[PDB]
Motif scaffolding. Structure first.
Motif, PDB file in Angstrom:
ATOM      1  N   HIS M   2       0.786  -1.231   0.000  1.00 42.62           N
ATOM      2  CA  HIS M   2       0.000   0.000   0.000  1.00 42.62           C
ATOM      3  C   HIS M   2       0.824   1.291   0.000  1.00 42.62           C
ATOM      4  O   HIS M   2       0.335   2.338  -0.421  1.00 42.62           O
ATOM      5  N   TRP M   5       1.049   4.013  -2.747  1.00 46.89           N
ATOM      6  CA  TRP M   5       0.232   5.222  -2.732  1.00 46.89           C
ATOM      7  C   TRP M   5       0.875   6.380  -1.981  1.00 46.89           C
ATOM      8  O   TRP M   5       0.318   7.482  -1.988  1.00 46.89           O
ATOM      9  N   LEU M   6       2.020   6.166  -1.337  1.00 46.03           N
ATOM     10  CA  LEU M   6       2.791   7.275  -0.789  1.00 46.03           C
ATOM     11  C   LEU M   6       3.705   7.907  -1.831  1.00 46.03           C
ATOM     12  O   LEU M   6       3.832   9.135  -1.876  1.00 46.03           O
TER      13      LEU M   6
ATOM     14  N   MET O   2      -0.785  11.518   1.438  1.00 46.16           N
ATOM     15  CA  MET O   2      -1.457  10.592   2.339  1.00 46.16           C
ATOM     16  C   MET O   2      -0.592  10.276   3.553  1.00 46.16           C
ATOM     17  O   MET O   2       0.632  10.158   3.450  1.00 46.16           O
ATOM     18  N   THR O   3      -1.235  10.129   4.709  1.00 48.36           N
ATOM     19  CA  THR O   3      -0.641   9.344   5.781  1.00 48.36           C
ATOM     20  C   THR O   3      -0.608   7.868   5.388  1.00 48.36           C
ATOM     21  O   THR O   3      -1.312   7.426   4.477  1.00 48.36           O
ATOM     22  N   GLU O   4       0.228   7.099   6.089  1.00 51.73           N
ATOM     23  CA  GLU O   4       0.294   5.663   5.839  1.00 51.73           C
ATOM     24  C   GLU O   4      -1.023   4.960   6.161  1.00 51.73           C
ATOM     25  O   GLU O   4      -1.385   3.988   5.488  1.00 51.73           O
ATOM     26  N   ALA O   7      -3.159   5.372   3.171  1.00 55.66           N
ATOM     27  CA  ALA O   7      -2.708   4.465   2.119  1.00 55.66           C
ATOM     28  C   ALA O   7      -3.180   3.033   2.353  1.00 55.66           C
ATOM     29  O   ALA O   7      -3.635   2.367   1.415  1.00 55.66           O
ATOM     30  N   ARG O   8      -3.069   2.536   3.587  1.00 54.13           N
ATOM     31  CA  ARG O   8      -3.575   1.200   3.905  1.00 54.13           C
ATOM     32  C   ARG O   8      -5.062   1.084   3.595  1.00 54.13           C
ATOM     33  O   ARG O   8      -5.503   0.142   2.927  1.00 54.13           O
ATOM     34  N   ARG O   9      -5.848   2.037   4.092  1.00 58.76           N
ATOM     35  CA  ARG O   9      -7.294   2.027   3.901  1.00 58.76           C
ATOM     36  C   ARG O   9      -7.668   2.121   2.424  1.00 58.76           C
ATOM     37  O   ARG O   9      -8.534   1.382   1.942  1.00 58.76           O
ATOM     38  N   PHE O  10      -7.024   3.032   1.692  1.00 60.14           N
ATOM     39  CA  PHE O  10      -7.264   3.168   0.255  1.00 60.14           C
ATOM     40  C   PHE O  10      -6.920   1.891  -0.507  1.00 60.14           C
ATOM     41  O   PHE O  10      -7.691   1.438  -1.360  1.00 60.14           O
ATOM     42  N   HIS O  11      -5.759   1.303  -0.214  1.00 59.43           N
ATOM     43  CA  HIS O  11      -5.288   0.127  -0.942  1.00 59.43           C
ATOM     44  C   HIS O  11      -6.260  -1.045  -0.867  1.00 59.43           C
ATOM     45  O   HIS O  11      -6.462  -1.752  -1.862  1.00 59.43           O
ATOM     46  N   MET O  14      -8.915  -0.350  -3.329  1.00 58.49           N
ATOM     47  CA  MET O  14      -8.345  -0.443  -4.671  1.00 58.49           C
ATOM     48  C   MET O  14      -8.127  -1.890  -5.102  1.00 58.49           C
ATOM     49  O   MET O  14      -8.394  -2.248  -6.254  1.00 58.49           O
TER      50      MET O  14
END
Ligand SMILES: CCCCCCCCCCCCCC(=O)OC[C@H](COP(=O)(O)OCC(O)COP(=O)(O)OC[C@@H](COC(=O)CCCCCCCCCCCCC)OC(=O)CCCCCCCCCCCCC)OC(=O)CCCCCCCCCCCCC
Ligand code: BCL
Ligand SMILES: CC[C@H]1c2cc3[nH]c4c(c3C)C(=O)[C@H](C(=O)OC)c4c3nc(cc4[nH]c(cc(n2)[C@@H]1C)c(C(C)=O)c4C)[C@@H](C)[C@@H]3CCC(=O)OC/C=C(\C)CCC[C@H](C)CCC[C@H](C)CCCC(C)C
Ligand SMILES: *[C@H]1O[C@H](CO)[C@@H](O[C@@H]2O[C@@H](C)[C@H](O)[C@@H](O)[C@H]2O)[C@H](O)[C@@H]1O[C@H]1O[C@H](C(=O)O)[C@@H](O[C@H]2O[C@H](CO)[C@@H](O)[C@H](O)[C@H]2NC(C)=O)[C@H](OC(C)=O)[C@H]1OC(C)=O
Ligand SMILES: CCCCCC/C=C\CCCCCCCC(=O)O[C@H](COC(=O)CCCCCCCCCCCCCCC)COP(=O)(O)OCCN
Ligand SMILES: COC(C)(C)C/C=C/C(C)=C/C=C/C(C=O)=C/C=C/C(C)=C/C=C/C=C(C)/C=C/C=C(\C)CC/C=C(C)/C=C/C=C(\C)C(=O)O
Ligand SMILES: COC(C)(C)C/C=C/C(C)=C/C=C/C(C=O)=C/C=C/C(C)=C/C=C/C=C(C)/C=C/C=C(\C)CC/C=C(C)/C=C/C=C(\C)C(=O)O
Ligand SMILES: COC(C)(C)C/C=C/C(C)=C/C=C/C(C=O)=C/C=C/C(C)=C/C=C/C=C(C)/C=C/C=C(\C)CC/C=C(C)/C=C/C=C(\C)C(=O)O
Ligand SMILES: COC(C)(C)C/C=C/C(C)=C/C=C/C(C=O)=C/C=C/C(C)=C/C=C/C=C(C)/C=C/C=C(\C)CC/C=C(C)/C=C/C=C(\C)C(=O)O
Ligand SMILES: COC(C)(C)C/C=C/C(C)=C/C=C/C(C=O)=C/C=C/C(C)=C/C=C/C=C(C)/C=C/C=C(\C)CC/C=C(C)/C=C/C=C(\C)C(=O)O
Ligand SMILES: COC(C)(C)C/C=C/C(C)=C/C=C/C(C)=C/C=C/C(C)=C/C=C\C=C(C)\C=C\C=C(C)\C=C\C=C(C)\C=C\CC(C)(C)OC
Ligand SMILES: CCCCCCCCCCCCO[C@@H]1O[C@H](CO)[C@@H](O[C@H]2O[C@H](CO)[C@@H](O)[C@H](O)[C@H]2O)[C@H](O)[C@H]1O
Ligand SMILES: [Fe+3]
Lengths: 335, 273, 48, 39, 99, 62, 71, 60, 60, 39, 39, 60, 60, 71, 39, 40
Positions: M2, M5-6, O2-4, O7-11, O14
Motif C-alpha cells: 500500500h 500510494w505514498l 497521504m498518511t500511511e 494508504a492502507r485504507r485506500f489500498h 483499490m
C-alpha cells in the motif's frame, strides 16, 4: 546583436491577472497558470476563459456537429478503429445527391450532412455573438466581431451559392482531402477560377496580408529594444521607436503609416481577403458559368499559338455528351 | 519634404558600400549606393518589359506575356525574341530585389534599428529565386521559369499544379497554405485588438495592454503578449514563403509522380500495413 | 435513366466521396480495408 | 437592479405576451391547416 | 540546466557535487563563487534600501531573497572546499587554490 | 439586351470605386502624425490632406 | 435532492439544459424528416398502412446526376 | 415563477428570445419552401387535393 | 468508500460522468441506427423473425 | 449564493416544469404512435 | 473540501442514483431484448 | 578508464545510451520486417532454402 | 504494498487508470465490431458453427 | 545495483517504464493484428497447419510455361 | 500527501475494486467464449 | 528530495521482483502462443 526572437529571462507573479477586468454577467472558468514554454515565445500565462450563455450554446451545438461528422466518417470505414485513424484524411461526410435539389435527402445520403452543416452554422453564429458581447463588456471597439463577420460571410457563401444554383449537392464535403477534391472540382466545373476577378482580388489581399504582417512584425521587432512593442503608448505618447518606424518606411518606399494606422491597413487587408472571396463565389454559377470565357470576353486571356487544329468533321466527332446518371444495372452481353 | 520630426535623424553613416558619396536623399527617398543600383535595374528591367510588350501581339495590360525559352536551350541564353529577353529581365529583377534588400539594411543601420526587415524580405527573394533560378537549374533548363505576364503566369501556375495531377496533396503545400491562412487570421486579430483599445466607443477611456491581453486570453485560452504577437506574425508570414519555396522545389527535382500517391508511406506504416 | 433501381447491398459503397477510387483505392491494397469498402450481405432471418 | 415587485410586474407582461403570441400562432395554424393539411 | 544548457543532454554537467579533483568542476566552481558573492552583496544592499524606505511586505521578501542567496552561495563554498581538499592530494592539479 | 456589360463586370467596378475610396481614407489616417511636412518652400500636406492629430483621454483609475 | 442547486449554480445549469434539449429535439426532428417512413412534410397525409416500411437500404437514391432542370 | 427574472435580466432574455424566434421562424419557412408539398410561392394556388404527396407504399 | 468524494471534488466528477454517459449513449444509438438489423426508424415494426441478419442467403 | 430554503423553493418549480414537459411529450408521442407506429 | 459526514451524505445519494439508473437501463434492455434479440 | 565518469555525468549518459539503443533496435527490426527475405511474422516458419532471395544478375 | 500510494498520488493514478481502461475497452469493442466474425450487431444471433472464419492457407 | 535508484527519482523511472511497456505492447499487438498469419480475431480458430504462411521463393526455374485451368 | 493509514485504507478498496472488475471481466469472457470461441 | 541507500535497497527489492514476475507472466504467454501457432 540581440534579435529579440525568444525570451531568456521570464518573471513570475504569484497573484495574477486572469481574474478579468470588471465584466458583470457570466463566469470566469478555471484558475490562471503559467507555461514556461509559452513564456519562451510569448506571454507565459495560460488561463481563464469566459463563455456566458452564447459560448455555452456554441460549444454544445458545435460538439454535436463534430460528433455527427466523426461518427459518419467512422461508420464509412465500417466502425474499424484502425482504418478510422489510417484513412482519416480521405474520409468525408458527403453532401446529398444532385437530383434532390433543395429537397430533404435520405439520412445516409446527405441527411446527416445537412444536419452537421446546420449545427455548425448555428455554432458559428453563437460564437460571433459571444465575441461581440465580450468586446463590449471589456469596453472595447467592435473591430474584432466585424473582422470575424468577414470570415463568416465567405463561409456562408458555401451555403448561399449552392442555394442560388439550386442543389445541396454543390456544398463542400466535411473531410480533409475530400474538401480539397471539392475545391479543385469547383474550379474545373466553372472553367478555371483563376479568371474570376474577385478570386484574383482575394489572392491579392491574401498575399498582401502576408506582406503587411511580415513588414509590421519585422518593423516592431526592429524597434522593440526602444520600446516599440508598447504600441498603445507609442500611439498615445509617440516615442523615438515610432518615429524611426515611420522614417524607415518613408525613406524606403516614399510614404509611411502611423503606429495606429498600420493596424487599419492590417485590418482591411485581412477583411477584404474573405469579403472579395465571398463575392467571387456568389457570382460563380449564377452570373458566370465559365470564367475563362468571361476572361476572353473581357480581354484577360493571353494568346498562345494553336497546339492542335480541328477539321469540321472532327468538330462534330469530338463533341461529347454532358455527364449523365450512372448505370443502375449490370448488363449481360451474351447475345 | 520632411516629417516635422525628421530632420534630426538625417545623419551620414550606416552605409555598406558607398560611404558619403551617395549618402543623401531625393524627396522622401533615401538613395545610397544600392538606391543607385536599384534604379538602374528597375529602369532597365522595366524598359525591357515594355520592349517585350511592344514586340508581342498586344498592349492590353492583362495579356502582355514575356515567356521563357523552350526547354531545348537548357541553361544557355536563347535568342532574345525566343526567351532571351525573359532571361535578361530575370537578371535585372534579381539585381533589383537584391539591391532593395541591401538598401533597407543601410536605412536600418542609419536609424539604429535591428536588421529584421531586410531578412524578412529575404524570404520573398528566396521564393522568387527558387521559382526562376534554383528549381529551373535543378531541372536543367531556364525554360522552367514562370512567364512574366499578369495572367499568363497564372496559366503557368495552373499547368505546373496539374503536372502532379492533384497538387493539393503536396504535403509542403498543405503546410504553406496553413501558414498563409493562419497569418491572415492572426493579422485580423492583432489589427482588431489594437484598434479596439485605441478607438473604444465614444465616451470610453482609451484602453490598455491589460484589456487586450484579457480579451486575447479568452479568445485563444492563453495570452501571447505584445512582443509575442509580432514574433508570431513574422514567423507565420515568412514561414509561409519558406514553405512555399520548399513545396515548389520538391515538385519535379525530387518528386515526379502525382502527389496523391506520395501518401502511400502513411498507409504502409507497419502498425497497420 | 427513366427511373432508378437499387444495386444489391453488397454493391453499395459505404464511402460516398467521389474521388476515393483514384485518390485512395488504386494505391491501397490492404485486405481488411478492401473488405470494408462495401456493405456486407444482409438477409431477413426467415430466409436463412 | 431588479426588485421583486418589479419582477412581478414584468412577469405580468411576459406571460401575457407569450400567451397572446401563442394564440396568434394557433390561428395561423388553423388557416394553414384549412388551406393544406399536413396529416 | 542554466550553465551547461544543451550540453547536459550529452552528460557534460560541471555543476554537480564533486569530491575528486576535476579541472572542469573547479573552473565552474571558481566562476560561480564570484557570481554568487556578488549576488549576495546585491541582495543585502537591496534589503538595506528597502528597510530604509520602510515598506513592510517588501522588507519581508528582501530578507527571504537574501537568505536564499546566502544558501546558494554556501553550496558553492562547500563545493569549493571539496575540490580544494582534492587538489592538495592529487598530482598535476592546479597550483592556485580553489576558494 | 446588353451583350458586353454583365453582373461580374458591374460588381468589379463597384469594388474599385470602394477600394480607391478606402485607400484615400487610409492615407488620411496615415497623416495624423508628422504632418504638415517641413520643406524649404513652407508647410506641405501632400494629398489627400491628413486628418487632424488625435487626442487620447486616459482613465481615472480604480 | 434540492441541494444539487447549492453545489451547481442554477443560472449556469439551465443554459446547459436548454441547449441540450434544443440540440436533442433538433437532431430527432431532422433524423425523422430525412427518413422515408417519417418524412411528414412530404408524406404526413399517408395512412400508416401505406407509409414506407423496411427502407433501410443505404443507397436508396442515385448518387450521381445533373442538377434538376434549372428554369 | 416571477423570481426567474431575478436570476436573468429580462433585457437579455427578451433579445435572446426575439433572436431565437426570428431564426426558428426563418428555418421553418425555409424548410417548407424547399419542399414539394409546401413550395407555396410557385404552387400555393393548388387545392389541397392537387398538392404533391410523397411516394406511397414502395414496392406494394 | 465515501472518502472518494474527499479525494475528488464531486462537483467535477458529476459533470464528467454526465458528459461521458451522454456521449456513450449518443454513440451507441448512432451505431445501432447505422446498422441494418437495428435501423429501427425505418424497420422497427418488422418483428424479429423477419428482421435483417448479417448472413448471405443459402444457395445464393 | 443560494440559501437552502431558496434552493428548496427553486427545486419545486424545476420538478413541476419537468413533469409538465414530460406530460406534454407523452401526449405528443401517443399522438405520433396513433398516427404511425414505429414498432 | 467536504467534511467526512458531508461526503457520507453525498455518497448515499450518488450510489442510489447510480443504481436507480442501472435499474431503469436494465428494464430498457428487457424491452429491447423482447423486441429484437441480438444473440 | 573509469575517470570518464568524473568528466561526464553518469546519470545523463545512461539516459542517452538507453535512448540510442531503443531507437537503433526498432529501426533494424522494422527494416527487416519490411523486407521480403525477413518478413518473419508472415514467413518465419519457412526453411532457409524456401525463404525469398533478391534477384541475381542474369550472367549474360 | 500500500505504500505505493505514498510515492504516487492516487488522485493522479485513478484518473490515469480510468482514462486508459475506457479508451482500451472502446478500441477492443470496435475492433471486434469491425471484424467479420464478431460483427455482433448484424450477426450476433448466428451460432458458433455459422459464424465467419478468416481464410486458411490454400492447401488446407 | 540498487544505487541506480539513488541516481534516478523512482517516481520518474516507473512512469517512464510503464509508458514504454504499454506502447510496446500495443505496437506488437497491432503489428500482428494486421498480418495474415496472426489475424487472430478473424482466423484464430484455425489450426497451426491451416494458418496462412507467406509465400516461398518460386519453383526453382522461376519461369512461366503454363497449362489452363479446367473449364 | 497521504498518511500511511490512509494508504492502507485506500489500498484495500483499490484491491477489492480491481478484483471485482476482474471477476466481472472473467464472466464476460466465458460468456463470449461459450457463444463464439476465438481459438 | 531525499533518497537514502536503505530506501534505494528496499525499492530495488520491489523493482527487481516486479520486473521478474512480469517476465515470468510474459514467458507463460509466449508458451501459450507458441503451442497455439509457432512463428518459426
Ligand atoms: C489590387 C490590390 C492592390 C493592393 C495594393 C494597394 C497599394 C496602396 C498603397 C500605395 C498607394 C499610396 C502611395 C502614396 O500614398 O504615396 C505617397 C504620395 C505622396 O505622399 P504625400 O505625403 O501625400 O506628399 C508628399 C509631398 O507633399 C512632398 O514630397 P516631396 O516634395 O519630397 O516629393 C514630391 C512627390 C510628388 O509626388 C509624386 O511624385 C507622386 C508619385 C506617384 C504617386 C502614386 C500614384 C499612383 C500609384 C503609382 C502609379 C504608377 C505605378 C507604376 O514625390 C513623392 O512623394 C514620391 C513618394 C510617393 C511614391 C509612391 C509610390 C507608390 C507606388 C504604388 C504602386 C502600386 C502598384 C499597383 O501620395 C500621392 O501622391 C497621392 C496618393 C493618393 C492615394 C492613391 C490612391 C488614389 C485613388 C484614386 C483617387 C482619385 C485620384 C487621386
Ligand atoms: C484548383 C483549385 C483552384 C482554386 C479554388 C478555390 C475555391 C473553390 C475557393 C478558393 C478560395 C480562395 N483561394 Mg483559390 N484556387 C486555386 C488557386 C489559388 C492560389 C494559387 C497560388 O494558385 C491561391 C493563393 C489561392 C487563394 C485563395 C484565397 C485568396 C481564397 C480563400 C480566402 C480565405 O481566407 O479562405 C480561407 C477562409 C475561410 C474558408 C473562411 C472560414 C471561416 C469560418 C467561419 C471558419 C469556421 C471554422 C469552424 C468554427 C470550425 C470547424 C471544425 C470542423 C467542422 C471539424 N487560390 C485554383 C484556381 N480557391 C475561395 C474564394 O474566396 O474564392 C473566391 C474559394 O471558395
Ligand atoms: C479575416 C479572414 C480570416 C479569419 C478571421 C477570423 N477568424 C476568426 C476570427 C477572425 C477575426 C475570430 O475572432 C474567431 C475566433 O474565435 O478566433 C480565435 C475566428 C475563428 N476562425 C476559426 C477558424 C478558421 N478561420 C479561418 C480563416 C480566416 N479567419 C480568414 C483567413 C479558417 C480556414 C482558413 O479554413 C479556419 C478553419 C475558428 C478557430 C474561430 C471561430 C470558432 C468557432 O466559431 O467555434 C465554434 C465552435 C465549435 C466548432 C465547437 C467546438 C467543440 C468543442 C471541441 C467541444 C468540447 C466539449 C464541450 C465543452 C461540450 C459542451 C458542454 C457545455 C455544458 C459547456
Ligand atoms: C442496365 O440498365 C441500365 C439502365 O438502362 C443501363 O444504363 C443506361 O445506359 C448508360 C448510358 C447510362 O449511364 C445509364 O444512365 C442508363 O441510361 C445499363 O447499361 C444496363 O443496360 C441494359 O439494360 C437496359 C435496361 O434499361 O434494362 C437495356 O435498355 C434497353 O432495354 C430496356 C428494356 O429492358 C428499355 O427500356 C430501354 O429503352 C432500352 N434502351 C436501349 C438504349 O436499347 C439495355 O439494352 C440496350 C440495347 O442498351 C441493356 O444493355 C445491354 C448491353 O444489355
Ligand atoms: C463594406 C462594403 C463594401 C461594398 C463593396 C461593393 C462591391 C461589390 C459588390 C456589389 C454587389 C454586386 C452584385 C452582383 C450581381 C449583379 O450585378 O447582377 C446583375 C444585375 O445588376 C446588379 O445587380 C447591379 C449591382 C450593383 C452593385 C451596387 C453598385 C452601386 C453602389 C456602389 C457603391 C460603391 C461604394 C460603396 C445581373 O447580371 P447579369 O450578368 O446576369 O446580367 C445579364 C443577364 N443576361
Ligand atoms: C428540424 O425540425 C424543425 C423542422 C425545425 C421542426 C422542429 C422545431 C422545434 C423543435 C421547435 C421548437 C420550438 C419551441 C420550443 O420551446 C418554441 C418556443 C417558443 C416560445 C417560448 C415563444 C415565446 C414567445 C414569447 C413572446 C413573444 C413574448 C412577448 C412579450 C411581450 C411582448 C411583453 C414584453 C414586456 C413588456 C412590453 C413590458 C415591459 C415593462 C417593464 C420593463 C416594466 O413595467 O417595468
Ligand atoms: C442518435 O440517435 C438519436 C435518434 C438522437 C437517439 C438518441 C437519443 C438520446 C441519446 C436521448 C437522450 C435523452 C436524454 C438524456 O438525458 C434526455 C433528458 C431530458 C431531460 C433531463 C429533460 C428535462 C427537462 C426539464 C425541463 C423542461 C424543466 C423546466 C423547468 C421550468 C420551466 C421551471 C423554471 C424555474 C422557475 C420558473 C423557477 C424560478 C424560481 C426562482 C428563481 C426562485 O424561487 O428563487
Ligand atoms: C456498440 O457500441 C460500443 C461503443 C462499441 C459498445 C461498447 C461500450 C462500452 C465500452 C461501454 C462502457 C460503459 C461503461 C463503463 O464503465 C459505463 C459506465 C456507467 C456508469 C458508471 C454509470 C453511472 C451512472 C450514475 C448516475 C446516472 C448517477 C446519478 C446520481 C444522481 C441522480 C444523484 C446525484 C447526487 C446529487 C444530486 C447530490 C445531492 C445532495 C447533495 C449535494 C448533498 O447532500 O450535499
Ligand atoms: C484489439 O486488441 C488489442 C488492443 C490490439 C489487444 C491488445 C491489448 C492490450 C495490450 C491490453 C492491455 C491491457 C491492460 C494493461 O496494459 C489492462 C490492465 C488492466 C487493469 C490494471 C485493470 C484494473 C482495474 C482496476 C479497477 C477498476 C479498480 C477500481 C477500484 C475502485 C472502484 C475503488 C476505488 C477506491 C475507493 C472507493 C476508496 C476511496 C477511499 C479513500 C480515498 C480513502 O480511504 O482515503
Ligand atoms: C514487432 O516488431 C518490433 C515491435 C519492432 C519488435 C520489437 C523490438 C524491440 C526493440 C523490443 C524491445 C523490448 C525491450 C527492450 O529492452 C523490453 C524490455 C522490457 C522491460 C525491461 C520490462 C520491465 C518491466 C518491469 C515492470 C513491469 C516492473 C514492475 C514493478 C513492480 C510491480 C513493483 C511495484 C512496487 C514498487 C514500485 C515499490 C513501491 C515502494 C514501496 C513498496 C516502498 O517504498 O516501501
Ligand atoms: C466519438 O467521438 C468521435 C471519436 C467520433 C469524435 C471524433 C471526431 C472526428 C475525428 C472528427 C473529424 C472531423 C474532420 C476531420 C472534419 C473536417 C472538416 C473540414 C476539413 C471541412 C471543410 C469545409 C467544410 C465546409 C465549408 C462546410 C460548410 C457547410 C455549410 C455552410 C453548411 C450549411 C448548412 C445549413 C445552413 C443547413 C441548414 C438546414 C436546412 C434544413 C435549412 O437545410 C438546408
Ligand atoms: C437518473 C435516474 C435515477 C433514478 C433514481 C430512482 C430513485 C432513487 C431514489 C430512491 C429514494 C430512496 O433512497 C434513499 O433516499 C435517501 C433520502 O431519502 C438517501 O439518504 C441519504 O441522505 C440522508 C440525509 O438526507 C442520510 O441520512 C443518509 O444516510 C443518506 O443515505 C439514501 O441514500 C437513498 O438510498
Ligand atoms: Fe502591431
Amino acid at each position: 546583436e540581440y534579435q529579440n526572437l525568444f525570451t531568456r529571462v521570464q518573471v513570475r507573479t504569484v497573484p495574477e491577472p486572469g481574474i478579468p477586468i470588471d465584466e458583470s454577467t457570466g463566469t470566469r472558468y478555471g484558475t490562471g497558470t503559467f507555461s514556461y514554454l509559452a513564456g519562451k515565445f510569448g506571454d507565459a500565462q495560460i488561463g481563464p476563459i469566459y463563455l456566458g450563455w452564447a459560448g455555452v450554446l456554441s460549444l454544445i451545438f458545435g460538439f454535436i456537429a463534430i460528433e455527427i461528422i466523426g461518427l459518419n466518417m467512422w461508420a464509412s470505414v465500417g466502425w474499424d478503429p484502425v482504418e478510422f485513424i489510417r484513412q482519416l484524411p480521405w474520409l468525408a461526410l458527403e453532401p446529398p445527391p444532385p437530383q434532390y435539389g433543395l429537397r430533404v435527402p435520405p439520412l445516409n445520403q446527405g441527411g446527416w450532412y445537412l444536419m452537421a452543416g446546420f449545427f455548425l452554422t448555428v455554432s458559428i453564429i453563437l460564437w460571433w455573438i459571444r465575441i461581440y458581447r465580450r468586446a463590449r463588456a471589456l469596453q472595447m471597439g467592435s473591430h474584432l466581431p466585424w473582422a470575424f463577420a468577414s470570415a463568416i460571410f465567405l463561409y456562408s457563401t458555401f451555403f448561399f451559392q449552392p442555394l442560388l444554383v439550386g442543389s445541396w449537392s454543390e456544398m463542400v464535403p466535411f473531410g480533409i482531402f475530400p474538401h480539397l477534391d471539392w475545391t479543385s472540382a469547383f474550379s474545373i466545373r466553372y472553367g478555371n477560377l483563376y479568371y474570376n476577378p474577385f478570386h484574383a482580388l482575394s489572392i491579392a489581399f491574401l498575399y498582401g496580408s502576408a506582406v503587411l504582417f511580415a513588414m509590421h512584425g519585422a518593423t516592431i521587432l526592429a524597434v522593440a529594444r526602444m520600446g516599440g512593442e508598447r504600441e498603445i503608448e507609442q500611439i498615445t505618447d509617440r516615442g523615438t521607436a515610432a518615429e524611426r518606424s515611420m522614417l524607415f518606411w518613408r525613406w524606403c518606399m516614399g510614404f509611411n503609416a502611423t503606429m495606429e494606422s498600420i493596424h487599419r491597413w492590417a485590418w482591411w487587408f485581412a477583411v477584404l481577403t474573405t469579403f472579395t472571396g465571398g463575392i467571387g463565389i456568389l457570382l460563380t454559377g449564377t452570373v458566370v458559368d465559365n470564367w475563362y470565357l468571361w476572361g476572353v470576353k473581357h480581354g484577360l486571356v493571353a494568346p498562345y499559338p494553336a497546339q492542335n487544329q480541328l477539321t469540321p468533321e472532327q468538330q462534330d466527332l469530338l463533341r461529347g455528351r454532358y455527364q449523365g446518371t450512372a448505370p443502375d444495372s449490370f448488363p449481360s452481353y451474351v447475345v | 519634404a520632411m516629417l516635422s520630426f525628421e530632420k534630426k535623424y538625417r545623419v551620414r553613416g550606416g552605409t555598406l558600400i558607398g560611404g558619403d558619396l551617395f549618402d543623401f536623399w531625393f524627396g522622401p527617398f533615401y538613395v545610397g549606393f544600392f538606391g543607385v543600383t536599384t534604379i538602374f535595374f528597375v529602369t532597365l528591367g522595366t524598359l525591357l518589359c515594355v520592349w517585350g510588350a511592344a514586340m508581342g501581339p498586344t498592349w492590353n495590360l492583362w495579356q502582355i506575356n514575356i515567356a521563357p525559352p523552350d526547354l531545348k536551350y537548357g541553361l544557355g541564353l536563347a535568342p532574345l525574341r525566343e526567351g532571351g529577353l525573359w532571361q535578361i529581365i530575370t537578371l535585372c529583377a534579381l539585381g533589383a530585389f537584391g539591391s532593395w534588400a541591401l538598401r533597407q539594411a543601410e536605412i536600418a543601420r542609419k536609424l539604429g534599428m535591428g536588421m529584421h526587415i531586410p531578412w524578412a524580405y529575404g524570404g520573398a527573394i528566396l521564393a522568387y529565386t527558387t521559382l526562376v533560378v534554383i528549381r529551373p537549374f535543378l531541372l536543367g533548363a531556364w525554360g522552367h521559369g514562370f512567364p512574366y505576364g499578369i495572367f499568363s503566369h497564372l496559366d503557368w501556375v495552373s499547368n505546373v499544379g496539374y503536372q502532379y495531377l492533384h497538387f493539393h496533396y503536396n504535403p509542403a503545400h498543405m503546410i504553406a497554405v496553413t501558414f498563409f491562412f493562419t497569418n491572415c487570421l492572426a493579422l485580423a486579430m492583432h489589427g482588431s485588438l489594437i484598434l479596439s483599445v485605441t478607438n473604444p466607443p465614444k465616451g470610453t477611456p482609451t484602453g490598455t495592454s491589460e484589456q487586450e491581453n484579457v480579451f486575447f486570453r479568452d479568445l485563444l485560452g492563453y495570452s501571447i503578449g505584445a512582443i509575442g504577437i509580432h514574433r508570431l506574425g513574422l514567423f507565420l508570414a515568412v514561414g509561409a514563403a519558406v514553405w512555399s519555396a520548399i513545396c515548389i522545389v520538391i515538385s519535379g527535382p525530387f518528386w515526379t509522380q502525382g502527389w496523391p500517391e506520395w501518401w502511400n508511406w502513411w498507409l504502409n506504416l507497419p502498425i497497420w500495413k | 435513366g427513366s427511373s432508378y433501381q437499387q444495386a444489391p447491398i453488397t454493391n453499395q459503397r459505404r464511402m460516398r466521396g467521389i474521388m476515393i477510387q483514384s485518390t485512395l483505392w488504386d494505391m491501397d491494397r490492404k485486405r481488411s480495408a478492401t473488405r470494408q469498402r462495401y456493405y456486407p450481405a444482409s438477409t431477413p432471418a426467415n430466409q436463412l | 437592479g431588479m426588485t421583486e415587485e418589479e419582477a412581478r410586474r414584468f412577469h405580468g407582461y411576459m406571460v401575457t405576451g407569450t400567451l397572446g403570441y401563442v394564440v396568434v400562432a394557433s390561428v395561423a395554424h388553423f388557416l394553414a391547416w384549412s388551406w393544406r393539411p399536413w396529416f | 540546466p542554466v550553465n551547461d544548457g544543451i550540453w547536459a543532454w550529452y552528460g557534460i554537467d560541471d555543476d554537480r557535487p564533486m569530491a575528486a579533483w576535476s579541472r572542469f568542476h573547479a573552473t565552474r566552481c571558481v566562476e560561480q563563487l564570484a557570481i554568487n558573492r556578488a549576488r549576495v552583496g546585491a541582495a543585502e544592499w537591496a534589503l538595506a534600501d528597502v528597510q530604509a524606505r520602510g515598506i513592510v511586505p517588501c522588507i519581508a521578501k528582501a530578507a527571504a531573497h537574501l537568505a536564499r542567496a546566502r544558501a546558494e552561495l554556501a553550496d558553492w563554498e562547500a563545493q569549493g572546499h571539496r575540490l580544494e581538499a582534492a587538489r592538495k592530494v592529487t598530482p598535476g592539479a592546479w597550483t592556485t587554490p580553489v576558494i | 439586351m446588353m451583350e458586353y456589360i454583365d453582373g461580374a463586370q458591374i460588381a468589379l467596378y463597384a469594388f474599385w470605386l470602394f477600394f480607391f475610396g478606402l485607400i484615400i481614407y487610409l492615407r488620411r489616417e496615415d497623416k495624423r502624425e508628422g504632418y504638415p511636412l517641413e520643406s524649404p518652400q513652407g508647410p506641405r500636406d501632400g494629398w489627400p490632406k491628413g486628418a487632424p492629430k488625435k487626442t487620447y483621454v486616459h482613465r481615472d483609475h480604480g | 435532492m434540492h441541494r444539487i442547486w447549492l453545489m451547481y449554480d442554477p443560472r449556469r445549469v439551465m443554459v446547459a439544459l436548454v441547449g441540450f434539449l434544443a440540440v436533442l429535439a433538433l437532431v430527432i426532428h431532422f433524423v425523422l424528416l430525412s427518413s422515408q417512413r417519417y418524412s411528414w412534410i412530404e408524406n404526413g397525409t399517408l395512412g400508416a398502412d401505406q407509409a414506407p416500411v423496411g427502407a433501410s437500404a443505404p443507397a436508396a437514391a442515385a448518387e450521381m446526376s445533373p442538377l434538376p432542370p434549372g428554369r
